[PDB]
């Protein structure tokens, strides 16, 4: 998978973009934790578990809280342009950490 930032356009199904985010706490970034099978994210085939979301419709989320990121994603409209960067090592760092 490419590790540089990536531009991804998703067209929203009435239900949603079809993925989950964690992060946006204690200065941590916003990451994709789950991709809903059959959803827009899943069919675009571009987003992955472990992706950090750097911006949505040009709104910088590098320094965002969780709630700020959630509000941005939910309100980004029908055509959502995402800047994402694949960071498996960082995601793993958290996931391992969470297993305690």
């Amino acid at each position: 998978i490419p590790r540089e930032p990536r531009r991804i356009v998703i067209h929203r199904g009435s239900t949603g973009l079809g993925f989950n985010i964690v992060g946006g706490e204690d200065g941590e970034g916003i990451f994709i934790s789950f991709i809903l099978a059959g959803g827009p994210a899943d069919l675009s085939g571009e987003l992955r578990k472990g992706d950090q979301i750097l911006s949505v419709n040009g709104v910088d989320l590098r320094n965002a809280s969780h709630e700020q990121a959630a509000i941005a994603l939910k309100n980004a409209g029908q055509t959502v342009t995402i800047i994402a960067q694949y960071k498996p090592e960082e995601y793993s760092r958290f996931e391992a950490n969470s297993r305690v």
Binding site: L17, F19, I21, E25, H66, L73
Partner: peptide, 6 residues
């Protein structure tokens, strides 16, 4: 702590 569906 938090996980949100979008």
């Amino acid at each position: 702590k938090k996980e949100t569906e979008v």
